[PDB]
Amino acid sequence: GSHSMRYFFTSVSRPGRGEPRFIAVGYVDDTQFVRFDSDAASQRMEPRAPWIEQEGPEYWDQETRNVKAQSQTDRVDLGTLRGYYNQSEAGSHTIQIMYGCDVGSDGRFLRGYRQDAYDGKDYIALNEDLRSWTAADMAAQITKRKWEAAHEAEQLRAYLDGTCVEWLRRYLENGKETLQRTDPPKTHMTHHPISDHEATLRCWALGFYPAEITLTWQRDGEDQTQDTELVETRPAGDGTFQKWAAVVVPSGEEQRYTCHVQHEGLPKPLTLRWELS
């Protein structure tokens, strides 16, 4: 199927407690392969996947310089954005950045992206065409004007639909033996009385990949949305995900309910029913 390469950056100011905390993480699909943490012992970009360890000293020297350059940029941008948003020097603030590219199963470029946030809200994003920007407000528009004048979109595009694609293809070839593949969910239902008259029916989906999944509950073929308890999809810690959806039902009425599982690894959407007797 399709694949992605993404770099995630978080910089958090610590007024009067030193320089900002900076954490960078590189992923191929949902697999971390590199990391940098300003609070870590090495002060270097570090390998996190077995297939990246084979990279040479010049690779690690370059990744370290370049991740440190992003850290320094965020440090000055925290001061700049505090100015744009008219905030004091006392509070802690956050810059988040994500950029990357997607390729098809035949290695072809599909899309590139860059999104930036300030204090957990949109700040600026590169558009789908890789030529223009969308600023979230009037302060972020100051950055957009600076990047339009600097022709930043062209420079960034050369990386997103170029360099990013070249290296993502190399990493996919280098990690082909271990990289997580599509795995359909293993599904089952559990039954938990909450009293003498009611029970929780819990529909489980385990060991699946990708994380995208839809769990729905129906009472007599009619949707149960607003009565369903859905948990956030969560990591098993092995590269696959888990999720459950629950409904509180009257005892004796279990068979009226159906759980519906939709996933890209399944040939057909599944229907689960609690069958009593």
Partner: peptide
Amino acid sequence: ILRGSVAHK
């Protein structure tokens, strides 16, 4: 690999 050029805001 990461970008080799950075943009100030």
